[PDB]
Ligand binder design. Structure first.
Ligand SMILES: CCCCC/C=C/C/C=C/C/C=C/C/C=C/CCCC(=O)OC[C@H](COP(=O)(O)O[C@H]1[C@H](O)[C@H](O)[C@H](OP(=O)(O)O)[C@@H](OP(=O)(O)O)[C@@H]1O)OC(=O)CCCCCCCCCCCCCCCCC
Length: 1335
């Protein structure tokens, strides 16, 4: 533990200094070897001395003195657009005072405490001290000085000399404490002239010395961790943050609620660490707290008390109590001074002294008037004026090290973090390699004949994609490291630009590894050009493409806030770049309005360069000559011709350059220019990213138990947790249940309520009115959890109504349920905000209101036996806890039985209970009986059995814990379990229990046949209510439906209008097929957006709803599945209307007069695809825990399905191994149905550049020579008035459709199969959620 710089800390510092000076070897009070030397002076002087002092001014102590300070300040998505319009009008074109006049002076080396109720303005005061005025303004008359400086100077020049970090202790979870402190140590070491001392050794010595000072020595080489990741103790992370802040040379530190959610034994340690920092390093700490112990308060020096923004006192912490006693108020006995000061601002509390009632302030104005009139204010004003006079009488870059070394240290820390967790790099590299292998398997050993042309094209396009999107995952790191960077920017350690540059540099090894592992496999598995120079140029182009894409992704991520928030707008841009690469829409077929996009497309140039590199100067053997078949067996090669874009009549080989110049319109003069253009793009995007990251940042039954014994199996060893604990509860009596940390009071509470999934009961017996527990027990009790888990959308009344409907008995009419909900709302004093959205804890209902809501939710179910409460008064201030205790007292008065577990209470709250049950270590009962008034009964019981008397001003809870021996540093005279066993009152307890069992057993039972039911409401009602609740929650989500609609509409519109009124030439059909292929890309983004709103529902259900037996698991999963169907259907209809019609696919149905069937079928297919997207996302999220893993798995499976969907390679070309994956795939049937419906039964008109020239035999006509082939296979011909024939190979679209294995007569069948797949998905979900999460 930590006891604040004791002898052992001094000797540790002595040893460290001895080792350091011995290492450096290779007056009397500074030499470690000599005696008469103490570590205090060494630590104080190490920062200043032992380092060359820059000529500039860098203060070593800041005391702040301010006078006349004052600060003032100023939905359903259907209404979201109107709200946005109103906000825009507000942007286009009264004052509320939060802090009133106040005076204060704070010298260096004094720890100051700010006291006040929540919302009193302490946080605003601390923000004003730390110059964090953003969000409000300060009056012009206020005089603020920092040892003679000004707020502007501190904000501009000496930033980092005053800091502010309130609750969120942000650290890299996977970085060791030693490394985390060494980072700041090295980044704060000045350079000047380092001769004599090695900088690295000095930084290590500073890190070790400050670790020893704050008692973190044992924590070295241990993960700092986070609330999720395991690591150092929660009480040591705060000390690590203090050590880091003080190590970066922060003079004035301000903390608020830093000790929130921490027990007294650790809040004391935190306060002690602050005190040592103040007294050794001479810093100025300010701390704002609500729950303070007397011992912790004894360490403070100056206290400032706030009352509704009015400063009522400021001075020595010891004199505040005397001053407010002179005021005329009375402090109740056994009340801590901090609690008294806080309660002095509560109208319910603060009972005046006798005789002082007539003259005593009652409102903040009177308090401030007296404070101003008091002589203490005069003395304070005199001191402040003297300080101002003294200050008046008496570095361009706030950072210390130069930019290059900031970048170097950022790179080093990035490498340390990567080595600490080799998950993202290794997984990314191996996933890339495996996906590359699988993809290349489709294009294995492309042939050298012209028949491979198309495939080669595809083989390049996808390559450009894989190198393009290889580094997409890297942006995730930016979101993990964003908070820390901001914090480190505030401390004035390194600019965010340095961090961005270091992040770019540190990922180069991973980019190199991925590029090698993917290209060296893909380029050679697919038989591209074998010339070494060609491969090297391909690798160079791919490397620069991935650089450009990585920088673009980083630039996008620099302004976003989440993966989904970045993906919603980024998907449209990425699709725009992908479609216009030059393969989906070759340049000759690009529309006029989109030709300009290709100019500014950084990926089109890469594709052009790669294709020019491959095809240029290459001769391909012909694979098919247009005149051929049984009719033509012996025809001179002169009359034939190859079926390629650049084919020349009578030539056996087609030239690659002609094909490129004719089909894609690329030339070899652009091979090298495009490399320069891509380098320019990379540099531009790097500059944009750096600029962005630099700038854009900112009850008749009685329940009892007898001889309960409970043991748990751990490490194959049986240890008893509860050893024969007996007790009872009664209506109208509150039974507090307390114990040490290891006493397992929570274990007893959970065991009594049957909420434990582990262990068995050995000897006990639980009885209700003398009868054994039946199956109706679990529904006849209420359980109020410590943590309040509620949906962020449903209002208070909606949540209460939902619980009432789904939990009360079915025979009760709806009107009675609503009446009882109103009664509960009235009884809890909740009427003020009965229609206020719960929302996140930050914005919405505060802690007290949330706790009241939870108690109401558990109450509306109408428990008949008991109401367990788990730590109701933990994590709340001293006033909210009192309010909750009063509410519990009222509930008990109304006729309820309560059994609550209390942790670290105060005397006043403790006085409000009727019975006490104390558990020693190991679950052994010490005392069990009424504690009387002011805990007199328990004190008398313990004293009369050989215990020291309780001090008059001691808190009974702490004294009890100490006498039992659980308190640290306390010795027990003898164990009290045994003395309690034979105490003359344990006999009374036994007699009472036996009498209750013998008498209450004769009371007639209330046999209700509906009670003995596992769930109160029938299954269909639960399913309907859960589905409606989820639908409403999605509707009210803050911009979740709008993101989905925008994404889908934008993608569909871009896809439709890129091929606007597409023609039906040979390349047109391929363009439309790839349009259908690219229609599916929004799948990944839709899944990513949808999953978190499933996570929220799952967490709420599992944490609270499931154990409470509100609705069955099947109801939950079925509701989640049915919730997304309506929104998906609507979005699919919108997408079809925005894609099918602009594409002009309806014209294809005009000749056959089948517009309506082919339109309805297409709409049904599109909606089915979207419903399938939702079902697949939910399935892949059913069994996994994190949303990221489910989204990644869904994307991987979707990509695998797309690879073998039949467009990239049909069944014949596909290797046999993968043939099964071409049949089990759910997208092949969808693609076939869509193509057959949209393209079948229409004519084909070949473009001018795709006609093939044929030279018929001498003395023959085009018809006479080509009719047999035309009959044998489709196509048509024209006369060119030059003796030749211009031939087109396709006359009707049915030929191409048959080539893709899509038939018009089978579309319906295909559609049906797809529906089956959706069905399967749903079924699997309803099964997997049972195997994985249901216990
Ligand atoms: C911080 C990020 C780090 C990123 C990594 C950094 C990378 C920086 C690298 C800088 C190195 C730059 C080297 C550029 C020098 C090119 C010298 C040839 C210039 C030229 O111009 O050579 C054209 C002919 C092919 O050109 P070609 O066949 O398409 O057409 C011509 C013919 O070559 C022919 O020779 C006739 O005339 P020429 O001789 O060319 O004048 C005519 O032929 P026809 O008209 O009859 O068809 C035509 O001109 O190169 C060929 O063969 C293939 C030869 C490979 C071309 C690049 C060399 C290898 C790649 C460079 C580095 C590889 C990757 C780097 C590491 C990877 C990962 C660590």
């Amino acid at each position: 533990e930590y006891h604040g710089f004791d002898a052992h800390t001094s000797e540790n510092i002595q040893n460290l200094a001895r080792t350091f000076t011995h290492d450096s070897f290779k007056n009397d009070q500074l030499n470690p070897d000599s005696e008469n030397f103490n570590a205090k002076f060494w630590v104080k002087n190490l920062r200043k001395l032992f380092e060359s002092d820059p000529e500039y001014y860098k203060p070593s102590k800041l005391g702040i003195g301010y006078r006349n300070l004052r600060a003032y300040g100023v939905p359903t998505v259907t209404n979201a657009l109107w709200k946005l319009a109103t906000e825009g009008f507000r942007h286009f074109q009264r004052y509320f005072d939060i802090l009133k006049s106040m005076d204060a002076i704070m010298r260096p080396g004094e720890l100051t405490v700010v006291l006040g109720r929540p919302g009193a303005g302490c946080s605003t005061l601390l923000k004003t001290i730390a110059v964090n005025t953003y969000g409000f303004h300060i009056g012009k008359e206020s005089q603020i000085t920092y040892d003679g400086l000004s707020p502007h100077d501190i904000e501009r020049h000496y930033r980092g000399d005053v800091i502010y970090s309130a609750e969120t202790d942000v650290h890299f979870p996977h970085l060791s404490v030693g490394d985390t402190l060494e980072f700041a140590a090295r980044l704060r070491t000045p350079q000047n002239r380092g001769e004599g001392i090695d900088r690295e050794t000095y930084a290590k010595h500073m890190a070790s010395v400050y670790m020893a000072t704050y008692g973190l020595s044992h924590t070295r080489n241990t993960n700092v961790g986070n609330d999720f990741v395991r690591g150092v103790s929660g009480g040591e992370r705060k000390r690590v943050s203090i050590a880091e802040a003080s190590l970066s040379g922060a003079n004035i530190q301000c903390w608020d609620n830093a000790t929130r959610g921490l027990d007294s034994a650790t809040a004391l340690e935190f306060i002690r660490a602050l005190k040592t920092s103040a007294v050794i390093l001479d810093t100025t700490p300010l701390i704002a707290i609500y729950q303070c112990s007397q011992d912790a308060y004894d360490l403070f020096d100056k206290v400032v008390v706030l009352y509704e923004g009015y400063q009522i006192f400021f001075g020595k912490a010891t004199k505040a109590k005397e001053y407010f006693e002179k005021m005329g108020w009375k402090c109740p006995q056994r009340q801590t001074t901090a609690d008294f000061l806080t309660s002095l601002t509560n109208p319910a509390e603060r009972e005046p002294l006798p005789g002082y009632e007539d003259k005593v302030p009652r409102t903040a104005q009177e308090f401030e008037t007296y404070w101003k009139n008091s002589p203490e204010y005069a003395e304070l004003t005199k001191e402040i004026d003297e300080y101002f006079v003294e200050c008046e009488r008496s570095p361009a870059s706030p950072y210390t090290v130069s930019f290059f070394m900031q970048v170097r240290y950022g790179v080093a820390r990035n490498f340390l973090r990567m080595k600490g967790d080799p998950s993202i790099p290794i997984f990314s590299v191996f996933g890339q390699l495996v996906m590359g292998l699988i993809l290349s398997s489709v294009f294995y050993n492309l042939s050298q004949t012209t028949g491979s042309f198309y495939y080669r094209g595809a083989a390049m396009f996808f390559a450009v994609l894989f190198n393009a999107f290889s580094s997409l995952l890297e942006i995730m790191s930016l979101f993990e490291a964003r908070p820390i960077v901001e914090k480190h920017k505030k401390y004035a350690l390194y600019r965010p630009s340095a961090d961005a540059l270091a992040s770019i540099i540190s990922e180069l090894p991973v980019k190199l590894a991925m590029s090698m592992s993917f290209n060296f496999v893909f380029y050679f598995m697919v038989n591209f050009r074998r010339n070494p120079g060609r491969f090297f140029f391909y690798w160079l182009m791919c490397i620069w493409c991935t650089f450009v894409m990585s920088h673009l992704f980083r630039s996008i991520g620099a302004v976003s806030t989440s993966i989904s928030g970045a993906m919603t707008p980024a998907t449209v841009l990425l699709l725009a770049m992908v479609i216009y690469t030059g393969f989906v829409i070759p340049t000759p077929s690009m529309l006029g309005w989109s030709r300009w996009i290709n100019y500014i497309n950084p990926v089109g140039y890469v594709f052009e360069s790669l294709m020019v590199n491959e095809f240029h100067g290459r001769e391909f053997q012909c694979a098919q000559y247009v005149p051929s078949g049984p009719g033509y067996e012996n025809i001179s090669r002169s009359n034939q011709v190859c079926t390629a874009v650049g084919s020349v009549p009578g030539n056996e080989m087609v030239s690659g350059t002609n094909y490129l110049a004719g089909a894609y319109q690329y030339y070899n003069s652009h091979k090298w220019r495009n490399l320069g253009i891509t380098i320019g793009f990379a540099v531009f995007f790097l500059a944009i990213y750096i600029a962005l990251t630099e700038f854009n940042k900112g009850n008749r039954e009685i329940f009892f138990w007898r001889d309960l014994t409970y043991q748990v199996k751990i490490k194959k060893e049986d240890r008893v947790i509860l050893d024969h604990v007996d007790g009872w509860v009664k209506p109208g009596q509150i039974t507090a249940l307390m114990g040490a940390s290891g006493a397992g009071k929570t274990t007893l509470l959970n065991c009594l309520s049957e909420r434990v999934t582990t262990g068995i009961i050995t000897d006990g017996e639980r009885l209700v009115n003398g009868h054994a527990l039946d199956s109706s027990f679990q529904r006849s009790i209420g359980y109020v959890q410590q943590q309040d888990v509620h949906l962020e959308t449903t209002t208070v009344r909606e949540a209460l109504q939902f619980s009432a409907y789904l939990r009360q008995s079915n025979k009760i009419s709806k009107k009675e349920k609503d009446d009882y909900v109103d009664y509960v709302i009235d009884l809890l004093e909740m009427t003020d905000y009965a229609d206020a959205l719960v929302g996140v804890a930050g914005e919405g209902l505060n802690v007290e209101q949330r706790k009241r809501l939870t108690i109401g939710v558990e109450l509306v179910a109408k428990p008949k036996l008991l109401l367990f409460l788990d730590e109701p008064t933990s994590g709340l201030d001293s006033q909210t806890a009192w309010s909750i205790c009063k509410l519990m007292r009222k509930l008990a008065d109304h006729g309820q039985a309560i059994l609550c577990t209390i942790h670290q209470p105060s005397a006043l709250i403790m006085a409000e209970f009727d019975r006490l049950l104390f558990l020693q270590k190991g679950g052994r009962t010490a005392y069990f009986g009424e504690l009387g008034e002011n805990c007199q009964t328990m004190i008398n019981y313990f004293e009369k059995y050989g215990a020291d008397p309780c001090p008059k001003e001691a808190n009974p809870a702490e004294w009890m814990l100490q006498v039992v021996g659980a308190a640290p540093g306390s010795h027990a005279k003898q164990d009290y379990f045994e003395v309690w066993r034979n105490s003359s009152e344990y006999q009374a307890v036994r007699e009472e229990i036996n009498r209750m069992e013998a008498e209450l057993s004769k009371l007639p039972r209330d046999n209700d046949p509906e009670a003995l039911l596992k769930y109160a409401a029938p299954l269909w009602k639960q399913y309907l209510l859960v589905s409606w609740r989820t639908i409403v929650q999605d509707w009210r989500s803050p911009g979740y439906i709008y993101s989905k609609i925008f994404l889908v509409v934008s993608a569909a519109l871009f896809n439709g209008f890129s091929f606007f009124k597409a023609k039906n030439n040979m390349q047109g059909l391929q363009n439309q097929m790839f349009s259908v292929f690219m229609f599916f890309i929004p799948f990944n983004t839709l899944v990513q957006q949808m999953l978190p709103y499933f996570v929220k529902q799952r967490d709420v259900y599992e944490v609270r709803e499931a154990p409470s037996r509100t609705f069955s698991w099947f109801a939950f999963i079925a509701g989640q599945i049915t919730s997304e169907i309506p929104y998906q259907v609507a979005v699919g209809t919108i997408a079809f209307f925005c894609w099918y019609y602009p594409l002009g696919l309806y014209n294809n149905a005009t000749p056959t007069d089948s517009v309506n069937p082919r339109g309805v079928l297409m709409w049904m297919l599109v909606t089915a695809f979207y419903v399938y997207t939702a079902t697949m996302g939910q399935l892949c999220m059913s069994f996994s825990e994190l949303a990221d893993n489910a989204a990644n798995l869904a994307t991987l499976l979707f990509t695998m399905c797309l690879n073998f969907c039949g467009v990239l390679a049909g069944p014949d070309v596909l290797p046999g191994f993968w043939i099964f994956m071409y049949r089990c795939n759910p997208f092949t049937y969808l693609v076939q149905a869509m193509l057959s419906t949209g393209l079948a039964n229409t004519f084909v008109k070949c473009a001018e550049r795709e006609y093939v020239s044929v030279k018929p035999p001498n003395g023959e006509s085009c018809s006479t020579y080509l009719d047999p082939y035309i009959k044998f296979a489709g196509g048509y011909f024209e006369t060119r008035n030059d003796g030749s024939c211009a031939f087109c190979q396709m006359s009707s679209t049915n030929t191409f459709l048959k080539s893709v294995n899509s038939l018009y007569s089978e579309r319906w069948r295909n559609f049906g199969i797809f529906i089956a797949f959706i069905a399967i998905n749903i079924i699997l979900t309803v099964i997997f959620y049972w195997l994985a999460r249901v216990p």
